[PDB]
Ligand binder design. Structure first.
Ligand SMILES: [Zn+2]
Ligand SMILES: [Zn+2]
Lengths: 128, 117, 196, 147, 144
């Protein structure tokens, strides 16, 4: 099964449950009812300004079933996204506290639909 | 979460488009034909359900109880009106028909209740 | 001799072409010397991006008779004298309480927000025809002639048949959307209710 | 349908189809549709009563034809679109008597199953006991027999 | 030459007496058909109530389709075997099959016991009408 997962072409689309984009200009007061933001709250990763200044974000929720079957973790997906997108993107994942597997993606510093374009370009050919 | 609907203008009745406020850091719906602005209701401007967990009972209509070619049962009474007879059928849809789920529609007149077994 | 049933909307799947689901209606008015003229209402597939850094959604595009280019649906609806996006959406999607279908039609609606006038819409209709136009003049009339006597003769060929043709084109687009959703199954070319 | 079972306004060939799952009702009056007559089952009961047979045996005397039975609202022509929305009984001796019920919601009844065959497949004795390729080959040969 | 000229003395035929089994064999065939039909019906009632679980590798509809085809193929094979145990060594179908001159055991099974499942494109008869194969059947009828 491990070799089977290491051979099959697994995109982000086959693993994601649903996705959406939001406008959350204050990560401290995230509008999407999560306190895992403690990371950003105490993160010294560039706060905003030229960084998380992008208020719009990509909130994508994974399912537990395909993450279990493909033998994947949140950190591996985040690392693949970071490697494929450089430092233009910021990814914050979710620990194994609930079944809701959350990836929040922000633009690091065309305007707003570019996030949707890279959402399509990330569902298509990430090659996890 | 939930779906996002198309916002509409009030003057020229075209589609409103999302944009940011550089001053107050809020989302505003703005037209492109005219110059009209509206305060947003939610942060979710785009959504995409990919796992496709849809409530099939919404797509079910009550009038399908009048179909003679649907099979009936007196084994499952209606929860609302207590009528003992109800028709049952499959999903009848794509992005579906991988699981054989029965959907019941009570055939009693002027109740039209549907449910899932 | 068998033939496909005329004046009936069908939704097929050209799985090899660039279109996900293609609708058609071999429209032929009874007791009309002219033959049938099939209109296609196709949806560009490109399930992901439209080979662009901006083209997100799938765009619905119509193949009209005597017009060689893939005309957008919204262009035709504007060319029928329906300028508002709200009115076109009324004619296409009959419920405003199912946001999923509106979201699916959103990219096609957002392709042609540049063209807002009936004049410009008809000018774009006349552009790239089987008989190309000379100037702004004699090309508006050719596009009007195509929209009057070429597509959908079964809903009527008259000056007051603009709104009936708009209703039937909205029905075609709505059935294509239902096929793209799967709420209605695709149509069979060998079902003998589809043949004459 | 009540007008078609009486031939008041709508011709017998015209077909109504009520799409029930999706709210549509389409009436076809085209020239080229292919239909076939079927009995009409009101109640699990047939509308072809004994009096119809009594008036039908005595043809050339009562001038009671097939068209009179069509006008009586007993048989009607069902085309292929309308077959998608009809519950068709195969034979009345089996599918109107109470049993462990199959549907008990029949609308039409087939006149006789042997009328599904063509002209050359109708001259085959016991064609259901054969194999289908053999029936096809006999249909080919039967238009070739000397006579 | 010599085998034909002996066949003149012996004689070989085939008839309707070679296609009829005794009533005990017919009872066995009908009992097997009834048991398999009831098994298919109870598999269907398991599938409706979501009590059928999907086989790893395919959808639930096909776990169902695999189950139904497996049951019907088992019925066909069992009925064929129970039919071909009752030739009484003079049946001319067995005379031609055992020699291998013309026919096989499948032809004997189809003539005597049961024709079996009919297939189009390797699967069962598709729903040409709206969710039914013929207008005589109720909609969404996955029975035999
Ligand atoms: Zn406006
Ligand atoms: Zn009820």
């Amino acid at each position: 099964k491990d070799i089977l997962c290491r051979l099959e072409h697994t995109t982000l689309r086959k693993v994601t449950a649903n996705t959406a984009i939001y406008y959350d200009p204050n990560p401290q007061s995230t509008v999407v009812a999560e306190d895992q933001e403690w990371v950003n709250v105490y993160y010294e990763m560039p706060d905003f300004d030229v960084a998380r200044i992008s208020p719009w974000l990509l909130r994508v929720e994974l399912d537990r079933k395909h993450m279990t079957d493909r033998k994947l973790t949140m950190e591996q997906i985040a690392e693949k996204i970071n490697a494929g997108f450089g430092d233009d993107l910021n990814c914050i994942f979710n620990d194994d506290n609930a079944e809701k597997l959350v990836l929040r993606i922000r633009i690091m510093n065309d305007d707003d639909v570019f996030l949707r374009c890279i959402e399509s370009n990330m569902l298509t050919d990430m090659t996890l | 979460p939930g779906f996002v609907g198309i916002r509409f203008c009030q003057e020229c009745n075209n589609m409103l488009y999302p944009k940011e406020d550089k001053e107050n850091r809020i989302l505003l719906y703005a037209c492109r034909n005219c110059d009209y602005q509206q305060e947003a209701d939610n942060s979710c401007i785009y959504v995409n359900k990919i796992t496709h967990e849809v409530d099939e009972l919404t797509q079910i209509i009550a009038d399908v109880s009048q179909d003679p070619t649907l099979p009936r049962t007196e084994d499952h009474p209606c929860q609302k009106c207590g009528h003992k007879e109800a028709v049952f059928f499959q999903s009848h849809s794509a992005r579906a028909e991988d699981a054989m789920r029965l959907y019941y529609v009570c055939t009693a007149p002027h109740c039209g209740h549907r449910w899932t077994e | 001799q068998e033939k496909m049933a005329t004046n009936t909307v069908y939704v097929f799947a050209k799985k090899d072409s660039k279109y996900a689901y293609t609708g058609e209606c071999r429209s032929c008015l009874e007791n009309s010397s002219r033959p049938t003229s099939t209109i296609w209402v196709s949806m560009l597939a490109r399930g992901g991006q439209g080979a662009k850094k901006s083209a997100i959604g799938q765009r619905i595009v119509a193949t009209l008779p005597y017009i060689k280019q893939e005309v957008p649906i919204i262009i035709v609806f504007r060319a029928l004298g329906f300028v508002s996006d709200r009115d076109i959406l009324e004619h296409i999607i009959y419920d405003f309480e199912d946001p999923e279908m509106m979201e699916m039609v959103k990219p096609s609606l957002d392709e042609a927000f540049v063209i807002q006038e009936q004049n410009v819409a008809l000018n774009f209709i006349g552009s790239r025809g089987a008989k190309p136009g000379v100037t702004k003049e004699k090309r508006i009339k050719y596009a009007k002639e195509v929209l009057q006597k070429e597509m959908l003769p079964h809903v009527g060929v008259s000056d007051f048949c603009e709104t009936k043709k708009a209703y039937f084109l909205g029905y075609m687009v709505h059935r294509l959307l239902l096929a793209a959703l799967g709420r209605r199954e695709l149509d069979d070319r060998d079902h003998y209710g589809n043949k004459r | 349908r009540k007008l078609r079972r009486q031939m008041d306004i709508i011709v017998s060939e015209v077909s109504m189809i009520r799409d029930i799952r999706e709210r549509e009702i389409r009436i076809y009056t085209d020239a080229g549709r292919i239909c076939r007559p079927l009995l009409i089952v009101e109640k699990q009961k047939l509308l072809l009563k004994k009096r119809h047979i009594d008036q039908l045996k005595e043809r050339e005397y009562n001038n009671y034809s097939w068209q009179d039975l069509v006008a009586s609202g007993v048989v009607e022509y069902i085309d292929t679109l309308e077959e998608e929305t009809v519950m068709l009984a195969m034979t009345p001796d089996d599918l109107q008597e109470k049993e462990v019920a199959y549907c008990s919601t029949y609308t039409h009844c087939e006149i006789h199953p042997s009328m599904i065959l063509g002209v050359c497949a109708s001259i085959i004795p016991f064609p259901d006991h054969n194999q289908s390729p053999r029936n096809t080959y006999q249909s080919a040969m039967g238009k070739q027999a000397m006579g | 030459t010599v085998i034909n000229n002996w066949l003149l003395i012996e004689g070989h035929t085939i008839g309707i007496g070679d296609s009829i089994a005794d009533s005990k064999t017919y009872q066995d065939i009908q009992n097997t058909i009834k048991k398999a039909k009831q098994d298919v019906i109870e598999v269907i009632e398991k599938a409706h109530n979501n009590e059928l679980e999907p086989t790893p590798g395919n959808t639930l509809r096909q776990t169902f389709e695999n189950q139904v085809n497996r049951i019907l193929n088992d019925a066909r094979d069992k009925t064929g075997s129970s039919a071909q145990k009752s030739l009484s060594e003079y049946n001319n179908f067995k005379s031609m099959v055992v020699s291998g001159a013309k026919g096989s055991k499948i032809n004997i099974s189809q003539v005597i016991a049961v024709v079996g499942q009919q297939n189009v494109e390797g699967k069962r008869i598709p729903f040409g009408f709206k969710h039914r194969t013929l207008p005589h059947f109720i909609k969404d009828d996955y029975g035999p």
